[PDB]
Design a protein around this ligand. Structure first.
Ligand SMILES: Cc1cc2nc3c(=O)[nH]c(=O)nc-3n(C[C@H](O)[C@H](O)[C@H](O)COP(=O)(O)OP(=O)(O)OC[C@H]3O[C@@H](n4cnc5c(N)ncnc54)[C@H](O)[C@@H]3O)c2cc1C
Ligand SMILES: Cc1cc2nc3c(=O)[nH]c(=O)nc-3n(C[C@H](O)[C@H](O)[C@H](O)COP(=O)(O)OP(=O)(O)OC[C@H]3O[C@@H](n4cnc5c(N)ncnc54)[C@H](O)[C@@H]3O)c2cc1C
Lengths: 462, 462
């Protein structure tokens, strides 16, 4: 037998939950399939527990300042287990909330692993039972990438961000491999909490896809905080030693000769080199659903797959791997399908990003280089500043704030904002609304400053 | 003899410095008169040292959380003198910078107290020497209000915010009188740093000119933090006692009878009841320059006084008593006068405000009640939320975040944003740019969220 629904959602993570909830508001008869824990990567091994750990790291960094601010010196060893237990409890509270959200919406929860069948009419099977709908959303997310043994023997001795959230103790010595935001965030947390930490990157700077100013500044701030940034460096092999691991590294700096270095006594080797979509076991071939060579589901601007009645959103499609993106694309899809809003879709331009470095980074819109390519060098003007936030007026430890505004054409439309500094995590959202509305430099000029803040600097550039 | 300039600025504070600097860029032959310290109230006894003290208070509040975040308990007595010395040094560094800014701009600094003369041609005298210009800006600011002895005998035994910045030790027991932002900020700082603190207010809540949600929430947060809010209470008399002061208070709660209470053993009684403009000794009458009954200089929308060639900006005019307002009005005036931009003026609508409470408050635009009066009840819709920031997921101490969006007309133009919560100090600026541009609820709807932040809540209201 086959049970029929209006909407079947494969994956109860960010995008799948949001899409199902909105569809149900519109009257859809919906079900969500989930093999593991509701909330997906973000709630269980992603955004949420990362932010708890970031808050813990931030707290610790600020307490280096406690004597400078007039208090007796707060000399203590962090106890990883204290926070791990509390973090885990918060994730459990959230799992229970998301289950209840589906129940309140009368969305059926199908527990298990879905795969498509060969029925010409798109149908899935879960635990030997079949389900069909005229609309099936694939929202299965991804997973961390790990090197192949054939390429890096011993790579399996490292962990990923998934394993980071299983750690029960602070590693004494950590080596994080990668240069993107996950690598940066993990390295910064581990180092702030007291691990002797290295960050191994293929080139000279982290975050090379971000604006050059952010890439530069973030690299400098990492080093100033005590993270050893191992530049032009790659892992060749990993071996188990009596103490932890030995990492064999090759370093090849331009203008120098290549050199092999052993890194001994590593407790935590964390691969943060990419994400792979969760599609291998879906039986996509049974319906001819199109993927790229990496396994991402191919979609159009409306989240359609190449197969009528089948859609995909979120990390499984490989574009803008963020929770709010999955959510927004999933909601827009629900209005298209169940409110018949044929133009309902997510605009993937001007999505804002925060990176929870120390201090945090915020960005929205085009890098200076992207703007130059799009508009022409003669038609781009940038404004920027660098300062030490007044928080540090009384401290011996310092962090900087850098800000860049990228403007296009005669009217100086603000096409990008890029910053790193205290408060930038909470500062960005409102500026992203302005950018999405097409604000010009004059619109920023026209807004009275709030003093004393860091944020006022973005409305007083000249 | 009389020396002639294009522009004479009386007062080297926020507005006067900014206006003189901009005028000099345009070629004006300018001079600034300053009787005390460059930077005025903000730098010396206002925004800047207040923010240092707020950062000190904030630090302390967060350290109540140190054990909850996995560290050994940071049990220490604050040392007021440590931070006072550092605060003072920062103010001195800023005094030196503002002096140098005038020197680099070739703006003459005239040290002393200016007053107008009776010369039909507007002229000032400073230390027996006369100066004239076709354009004279009055930017003399204000000072704290104190009660008259005839009304409150012993009032002179209290201090004001000026005296707060002279304190060399933490008062054991503090009573702050007032209900506006200065009173709120002082009470919150003193209490966070360990003073046994009361805040005495005439009605039931603080910040009654702010949106009702902020007034309510701010009052509750003060009480939850240990500030004793003495409602419907006024000082009748103050007397010196062997220990500190005794404050005689009358309390008259609606529905109850009036009662007299003595508050003994008060170390610091701080009057934060208002500001008075600094005009008494200017000899305004010699030129017939118009003032209100409180001594504020009357101006039009272009900062003109009633006398040709004489202008006023900033706190001396009694409207929107903020540093960025003085600065912006002063710059706009310089472009009007010296760039001949006849429409150059400051729009006093949609000026954003932060109050450095615990947690901070941000507001821009109309309160819900203001919007209802302007647009009609049928044409206003509000959206709001309340939550506990995830920072507190792991702590026993709690603070809330409240947010309100006030929308007008069919298009739901965003005419007000009001919030209190962690991060709100740095969150507001960008939203103020959006409001100034006429953002609608759809424009907020259209902006992808940044997760996990508090700020995302303002773009996900429903
Ligand atoms: C370490 C880390 C930090 C991050 N930090 C942030 C951040 O701060 N902000 C941000 O916006 N994003 C962040 N992200 C990214 C964010 O987690 C993802 O973009 C988001 O979770 C993607 O949502 P999704 O719905 O595509 O997939 P997911 O949330 O991954 O959900 C997919 C779900 O599908 C289920 N599933 C898979 N296959 C099947 C199947 N066949 N049958 C049944 N169920 C199945 C899975 O168990 C899972 O629950 C972070 C990610 C990581 C790893
Ligand atoms: C405790 C406190 C906290 C504050 N916090 C903030 C905040 O966080 N943010 C914010 O935006 N605003 C804040 N303010 C308000 C801000 O300080 C004022 O709005 C701002 O300083 C007004 O600038 P102004 O140019 O009008 O006057 P002022 O900056 O006061 O400058 C006037 C100057 O004129 C000089 N002077 C006066 N008469 C004469 C004369 N006849 N001859 C020569 N010189 C003379 C004075 O010595 C002074 O230097 C705060 C104020 C206080 C008191």
């Amino acid at each position: 037998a086959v049970a029929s629904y209006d909407y079947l959602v494969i994956g109860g993570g960010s995008g799948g939950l949001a899409s199902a909830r909105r569809a149900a508001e519109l009257g859809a008869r919906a079900a969500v399939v989930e093999s593991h824990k509701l909330g997906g990567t973000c709630v269980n091994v992603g955004c949420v527990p990362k932010k708890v750990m970031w808050n813990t790291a931030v707290h610790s960094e600020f307490m280096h300042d406690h004597a400078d601010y007039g208090f007796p010196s707060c000399e203590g060893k962090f106890n990883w287990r204290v926070i791990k237990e509390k973090r885990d409890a918060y994730v459990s509270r959230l799992n229970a909330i998301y289950q209840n959200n589906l129940t309140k919406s009368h969305i059926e929860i199908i527990r298990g692993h879905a795969a498509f069948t060969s029925d010409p009419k798109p149908t899935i099977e879960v635990s030997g039972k079949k389900y069909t709908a005229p609309h099936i959303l694939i929202a299965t997310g991804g997973m961390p990438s790990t090197p192949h043994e054939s390429q890096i023997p011993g790579a399996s001795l490292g962990i990923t961000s998934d394993g980071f959230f299983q750690l029960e103790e602070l590693p004494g010595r950590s080596v994080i491999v990668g240069a993107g935001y996950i690598a940066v965030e993990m390295a910064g947390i581990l180092s702030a909490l007291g691990s002797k930490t290295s960050l191994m990157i293929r080139h000279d700077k982290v975050l090379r896809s971000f604006d050059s100013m952010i890439s530069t500044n973030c690299t400098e701030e990492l080093e100033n905080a005590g993270v050893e940034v191992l530049k032009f460096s790659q892992v060749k092999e990993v071996k188990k030693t009596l103490s932890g691991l030995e990492v064999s590294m090759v370093t090849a700096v331009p203008g120098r000769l290549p050199v092999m270095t052993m890194i001994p006594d590593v407790d935590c080797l964390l691969w943060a080199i990419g994400r792979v979509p969760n599609t291998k076991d879906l039986s996509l071939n049974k319906l001819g659903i199109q993927t790229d060579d990496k396994g991402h589901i191919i979609v159009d601007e409306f989240q359609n797959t190449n197969v009528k009645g089948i859609y995909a959103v979120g990390d499984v499609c490989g574009k803008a791997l963020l929770t709010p993106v999955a959510i927004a694309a999933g909601r827009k899809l629900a209005h298209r399908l169940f409110e018949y809003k044929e133009d309902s879709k997510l605009d993937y331009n001007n999505i804002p990003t925060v990176v929870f470095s120390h201090p945090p980074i915020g960005t929205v819109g085009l890098t200076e280089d992207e703007a130059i390519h799009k508009y022409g060098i003669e038609n781009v003007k940038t404004y920027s500043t660098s300062f030490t936030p007044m928080y540090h007026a009384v401290t011996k430890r310092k962090t900087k704030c850098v800000m860049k505004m990228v403007c296009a054409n005669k009217e100086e439309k603000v096409v990008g904002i890029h910053m790193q500094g205290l408060g930038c995590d909470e500062m960005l959202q409102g500026f992203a609304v302005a950018v999405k509305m097409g604000a010009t430099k004059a619109d920023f000029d026209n807004t009275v400053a709030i003093h004393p803040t860091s944020s006022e600097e973005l409305v007083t550039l000249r």
